[PDB]
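CO-FOLDING WORKSHEET

Operator: S.A.
Ligand of interest: 5-alpha-dihydrotestosterone
Run index: 243
Mode: holo prediction, single chain
Checklist:
[x] sequence pasted
[x] SMILES validated
[ ] output reviewed
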Amino acid sequence: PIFLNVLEAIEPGVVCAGHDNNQPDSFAALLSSLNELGERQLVHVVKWAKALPGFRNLHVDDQMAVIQYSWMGLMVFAMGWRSFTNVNSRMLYFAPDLVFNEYRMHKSRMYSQCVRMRHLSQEFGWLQITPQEFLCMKALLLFSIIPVDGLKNQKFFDELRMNYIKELDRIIATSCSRRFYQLTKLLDSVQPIARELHQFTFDLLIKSHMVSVDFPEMMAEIISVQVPKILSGKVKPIYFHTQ
Ligand SMILES: C[C@]12CCC(=O)C[C@@H]1CC[C@@H]1[C@@H]2CC[C@]2(C)[C@@H](O)CC[C@@H]12
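OUTPUT RECEIVED:
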């Protein structure tokens, strides 16, 4: 299980948000902490991605683009997994020091988005997703959103995505057909959630001053340069099933 060995080996560890749980729950503090959590996770996602089998075959500009477009989905998926394995989807486990209960989902002004995320988390249980399945699915998420006009070296990307899809089917192995169908359906469901968060973070960045919400360096640049390309339709997610 060479492929599975690698994915398990490179899987990022625990990342705290640095939230002061002693201070009252407020939109400002919660979102600021989420943004800081995102900055920290971004660092881990970059190291993880670059250590993925074949990732370095991609053109260098494509390497960063793929990461900059797929980070929302990747982080939402892993967070849903953490919520499943830690609190059985009861709450959203963003970090050990930033767990969202219903009250926080409301104060964050992202209640509808959190609902979709908790639903995603519940799916891990309803589908009995295995740790091994989780890992391959997460890897595939990195190769699930690109420029409609293509990447610098689209062929390298296509071969890479193909091989990761084949690995998912592999660990899966009538029954297998049902399983693959279900996991690809689950993967597709991540995209709508990611787009809602893209829209939300974009709007929040634009009015960040007014509501006292702080965005760290990497987050601000990516959200003002990359995210708009997605919201304007220049960059679109890759779906398995027709939407
Ligand atoms: C990706 C993060 C942080 C990592 C995670 O566990 C998932 C979570 C999903 C909501 C994101 C948050 C990062 C900061 C964002 C983008 C806020 O600006 C609004 C939505 C937040």
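REVIEW:
The pocket of 5-alpha-dihydrotestosterone is lined by residues 31, 34-35, 37-38, 41, 72, 75-76, 79, 94, 197, 200-201, 204 (CB under 6 Å).
Residues 136 and 168 are 6 Å apart (CA to CA).
[x] output reviewed
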